[PDB]
Amino acid sequence: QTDMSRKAFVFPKESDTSYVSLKAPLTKPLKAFTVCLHFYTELSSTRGYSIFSYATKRQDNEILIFWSKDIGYSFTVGGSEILFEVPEVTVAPVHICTSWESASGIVEFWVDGKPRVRKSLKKGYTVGAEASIILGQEQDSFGGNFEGSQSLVGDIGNVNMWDFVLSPDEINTIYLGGPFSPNVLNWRALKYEVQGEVFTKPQLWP
Template structure:
């Protein structure tokens, strides 16, 4: 699967707790969600992973508060075809094999930020939002979307994805009100836009490795395609920030590039979106399911940033 959630925000503050019974001191279990940051009304799978015993015969799935088991048999996967709030709760997987039994628990919850925004009230060099997710493998395609509202006329960063090898691995920024810059692997293309301070702007940027084609949409309208970094692979070990530009891995902030204003509706996919899918993202109805997004955002605030309705 393409991504994994880092830290304690998003789906579960404690992804798995394992308890070994009987002769299972060499057998452990944990529960892994796919995708790690699920989206409402899309498919979600919980996978009960076991180490120490390759011949597990039975998996028992239970939910706290339910009298009857959810599933019992040889399948280690529990599938929700359309994940919704009725599925929230604590789940237990009991794996039984010749070496004994291992039990894993998982707290499934969602952090839906629809109708809310991150407010960055003033210039700082230490206020930002960390998006606590990362790819598990290099990206050959991706799309990033977000909505911003600001009256800044100086350069500022919107979305900063840095690796140890490249601080501008992915960067969406505005050097001035009439220009967006989209970086991949340290190189950038420019998209010129009308100046507007009277309303928020919804921007999406996508890139594909085989052709190097980069696309940009502003408020659902596509701009002419451009190209950069053909056959490049975006690194997986990343720090992802809103509100500051990283000049090194996870730091190197410059107050003169900090964001002041509001950011919301942040999404990232490991594929290019169609025009219709971009419009869906504008209204917080993402399809297909993103790597992470506003309907279940794994984040942590640092400094003076506020989540407001």
């Protein structure tokens, strides 16, 4: 476990082999979650990349957040996809939170502490506990099958993940830097594994 407070991982050029592998302590399968993070890149109006990748040996897009060109954000759990379109694109660092709850199948998508309309996705699913979480590359198989054309080029940081659903208040206090307490993934106690060209440096966002 390592405190990465104030730091970030950076991926400086396109590649096929660079990535960070987060280890989570899961034992029970997920019936809801929240995930939040910060990232910064110029890719957005030239191609598309993977922002967060969650995979079991049985499904490779279990949960996955992804930017795709000329459309917008693309959230998917259990192989099924949903869209939040962005018309105007602009360059600056971005903070997102994203949550999903089985029973209702409602997903919320927060961009910079403002929320998008709610949507429905895979009501009643339960997400698998033995997983491969990966920054920088997109998985087409447990642990691997990366695609250079889906690479993150820039830095990414502040990834935290809870196994329940954050309320609008709590997402405001994470956004503003207030203390929270993750129970699946904690930036102040990370357990990760690096490979290829990725550096750890100070963060460009407040």
